[model samples]
Target: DILIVNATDVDEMLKQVEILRRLGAKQIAVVSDDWRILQEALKKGGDILIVNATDVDEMLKQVEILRRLGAKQIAVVSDDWRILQEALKKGGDILIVNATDVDEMLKQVEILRRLGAKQIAVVSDDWRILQEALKKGGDILIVNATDVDEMLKQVEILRRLGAKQIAVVSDDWRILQEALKK
Candidate 1:
């Protein structure tokens, strides 16, 4: 299975990789927007790498350099339409969209579908967007909720919307526990 880790530094990346390895992860995808961290992870034997760049040009350049350095697979994570389109056109293995608003999220989803994106992940807290995203063929749903009641309500809504894979992100343990029960 593939394990995705969002790491800021080389040390943290290695530590997380080691933990995942012990847990039986065959392929680990290190995620970082920093160019230096991405390069260091590759040199430290990262199996796959995900670039989360806000700037389209910088992301493209980094992906190109990583490809030349023999990166096994490169996934692009962005909220921008231009970045997602360009990355997919250039043979990116996966595309993750950090969605926020409903209209913007739906627009990106539709565009990515037209570009023949095989894998698309929508990250958002809005259940409305998540439901629409699933209908539009989003492969994964990451919910970022701040309010406990809202989180619970959204999870139920997403389940009714037929979401098979749902990930909830919250800082409160109580919120996580409440979601875990569902």
Candidate 2:
């Protein structure tokens, strides 16, 4: 997964996506709020979109666009907390950091669960981060793994702590197998 940041400008964001595609990027996430590039982005059909709309209504509309485009992963970055509820109603799976601290994040996660969010991703490898995500009822917990053994241990720990669905990050086949086994 490649997070293509600084693509707030619609035209530049599209251009970067083209470059990334031609370079054979398997998964690309384009972050943009400019309504101008929605049509071009939609043409790709299968992109992980991190929409940067500032208003709840605009975010909801863009999420609808992502759904129509068959986006497999949809995340919204609107500042308003209402966007979480609105976007989920329209099939969004990610709410971009409405909470900055751990306690606040857990609170936000509960709200997300109440709103029917079934999965959440945390881009950290820290033990507490994993603990917090699972404690907040993250249906699918996505985490970064540095070593297979350590990750396996973390997986076991997470399971002990009540994590049901866990995902470990790795490109190696052996690592993938081992993670699945744990």
Candidate 3:
């Protein structure tokens, strides 16, 4: 079993998949918010395994995969306190640390004192996370209420909704940083 870790751009990794296959990869899998690219790969006949290596999964998939790979322990970091909290709740194989828990945030590069959201917001689905985000004071107007799939599936939902003018303060910084770094 071959694992492709930290794929920042799905389209970019799909290119590598073709190469890995020729280099003797029996199965290639990628996980990211770029569902469009992933779907494209599957359409193009990629024998790939995709794991939602973000705030989406319980990290059980990773643990099982690594255990099969003979891994003993691992460390995790996330921008969301929720992931860390959940990881701690399901104690066994995963360790997590939210950014705020790691370092003392004694400074800020930019602090917007006054900000504005959109006039109308819409959500494609009903998710606990999204609901919580909204309850946490996320403005209703100017929302991309789209999911990971929409972010990559049909990006026009946002494009057509004047999201260009909306303040896109996305969370899930932990996985996004790793995902984008690839």
Candidate 4:
């Protein structure tokens, strides 16, 4: 999980890649936003470096070099449609449409697990989503409503039954959701 490079120094950069390779860098990639850096990377050889400064022409060059250097797969991410299409033509393996705010991701994961699915990854950028999913109880528990009528009825019934510590939910949305949680 280490990346090695020497910025603004070609001799030292090559040495770094060599050293990392010798030390078991089975998957070394040189990443840079500079064209010169990417050019040097292709010439020097590495595993999977990200080059951010690539036009369609430049990307083709890099792809050719990467393929020649024995890359099994190549990927390019961009918002430019023209370049994306061209990159696909140049043999990029996959494309990602990065989206946000997908609810029920945890529920879907639990459903998959119950169906005996393995290697399932719930890819969420939300920390709270991840935290709630890993809780002791079910991930998608129905929360109580704000209504208080149900809680009041429950308490009234429990009091008649001589039960203490009784809680009541009212007809309000909050109380109703809370009772549903129970």
- The alpha-carbon lDDT assigned to residue 105 of candidate 2 equals 64
Worst 10 residues of 3 by lDDT: 104-113
Q: What TM-score against the true fold does each predicted structure earn?
A: 0.72, 0.59, 0.29, 0.38
Predicted structure 3, TM vs. truth: 0.29
Writing each residue's lDDT as its tens digit, candidate 1 over 31-61 gives: 7878678877767666778898888888889
RMSD (Å) of each candidate, 1 decimal: 4.4, 6.7, 14.8, 19.5
Candidate 4 RMSD to the real structure: 19.5
> What's the distance in Å from true for residue 114, model 4?
26
Best candidate, TM-score-wise?
Answer: 1
**Per-model tally of clashing residue pairs:** 0, 0, 6, 28
Give candidate 2's error at residue 43 in angstroms. 2.4
Model 3 pairs in collision: 8-179, 28-48, 29-49, 79-174, 118-141, 118-142
Order the numbered candidates by TM-score, best leading: 1, 2, 4, 3
Our tally of clashes for model 4 stands at: 28
Predicted candidate 2 versus true structure: per-residue lDDT over 106-167, tens digit per residue: 66677777777765554456768768766656655545566878877877887788877565
**Clashes in model 1: which pairs?**
none
- In candidate 2, which residue pairs get closer than 3 Å at backbone N, Cα or C atoms, i.e. clash? none
Candidate 3 or 1, higher TM-score: 1
Question: In candidate 1, what residue range of length 10 has the lowest lDDT sum?
Answer: 169-178
